[PDB]
Design a protein around this motif. Structure first.
Motif, mmCIF file in Angstrom:
data_model
loop_
_atom_site.group_PDB
_atom_site.id
_atom_site.type_symbol
_atom_site.label_atom_id
_atom_site.label_comp_id
_atom_site.label_asym_id
_atom_site.label_seq_id
_atom_site.Cartn_x
_atom_site.Cartn_y
_atom_site.Cartn_z
ATOM 1 N N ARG A 69 8.806 27.263 37.866
ATOM 2 C CA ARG A 69 8.441 26.446 36.590
ATOM 3 C C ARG A 69 9.733 25.827 36.010
ATOM 4 O O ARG A 69 10.730 26.651 36.150
ATOM 5 C CB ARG A 69 7.601 27.267 35.806
ATOM 6 N N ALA A 70 9.867 24.905 35.502
ATOM 7 C CA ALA A 70 10.863 24.399 34.265
ATOM 8 C C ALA A 70 10.396 23.337 33.600
ATOM 9 O O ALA A 70 10.139 21.953 33.969
ATOM 10 C CB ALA A 70 12.070 23.772 35.237
ATOM 11 N N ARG A 71 9.920 23.713 32.322
ATOM 12 C CA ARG A 71 9.229 23.011 31.448
ATOM 13 C C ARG A 71 7.929 22.506 31.660
ATOM 14 O O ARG A 71 7.906 21.169 31.979
ATOM 15 C CB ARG A 71 10.309 22.060 30.662
ATOM 16 N N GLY A 72 6.939 23.200 31.785
ATOM 17 C CA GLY A 72 5.935 22.875 32.193
ATOM 18 C C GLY A 72 4.745 22.717 31.085
ATOM 19 O O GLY A 72 4.991 22.368 30.012
ATOM 20 N N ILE A 115 1.865 24.249 28.139
ATOM 21 C CA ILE A 115 2.244 25.167 27.220
ATOM 22 C C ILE A 115 0.929 25.409 26.444
ATOM 23 O O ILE A 115 0.049 24.664 26.175
ATOM 24 C CB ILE A 115 3.083 24.367 25.846
ATOM 25 N N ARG A 135 1.687 28.271 21.494
ATOM 26 C CA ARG A 135 2.963 27.297 21.979
ATOM 27 C C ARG A 135 4.061 27.839 22.874
ATOM 28 O O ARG A 135 5.242 27.440 22.819
ATOM 29 C CB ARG A 135 3.675 26.560 20.817
ATOM 30 N N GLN A 136 3.376 28.906 23.465
ATOM 31 C CA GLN A 136 4.080 29.371 24.778
ATOM 32 C C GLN A 136 3.520 29.051 26.000
ATOM 33 O O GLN A 136 2.704 28.292 26.046
ATOM 34 C CB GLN A 136 4.208 30.941 24.636
ATOM 35 N N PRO A 137 4.396 28.984 27.166
ATOM 36 C CA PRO A 137 3.963 28.619 28.215
ATOM 37 C C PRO A 137 2.745 29.175 28.975
ATOM 38 O O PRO A 137 2.465 30.310 28.401
ATOM 39 C CB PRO A 137 5.213 28.870 29.360
#
Lengths: 49, 44
Positions: free
Chosen positions: A34-37, A39, A44-46
């Motif tokens: 994962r890299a900025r997927g 939320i 408002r967390q992954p």
RNA sequence: UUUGGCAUAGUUCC
């Protein structure tokens, strides 16, 4: 005999036909990154999963 | 910072819509349901 | 290019 060089291996190896099983756990069903997927909404967390 | 009589709740804060978000068919949270019940009893 | 949640069960690894 060694495969690459062709020379005999000094220690004799124990070899014979054993009955093996292929378990359900593969790697194509376990690799994950994962890299900025997406939320989560409340924190408002992954996401999870 | 903390006067003794303030511990008796006479004004009830309502959390904003961020604390109790709507659900996407629109669903209301447990907090929203309890707030609706409380305001119903209060106006009655 | 847009986002459901609660519960229960099973499994992997120390």
């Amino acid at each position: 005999y060694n495969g690459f060089t062709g020379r005999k291996i000094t220690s004799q190896i124990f070899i014979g036909p054993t009955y093996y099983q292929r378990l359900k756990h593969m790697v194509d069903d376990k690799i994950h990154s994962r890299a900025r997927g997406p939320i989560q909404i409340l924190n408002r967390q992954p996401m999870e999963g | 910072y903390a006067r003794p009589e303030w511990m008796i709740v006479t004004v009830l804060p309502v959390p904003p819509l961020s604390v109790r978000p709507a659900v996407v068919a629109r669903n209301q949270d447990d907090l929203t349901h309890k707030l609706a019940d409380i305001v119903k009893i209060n106006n009655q």
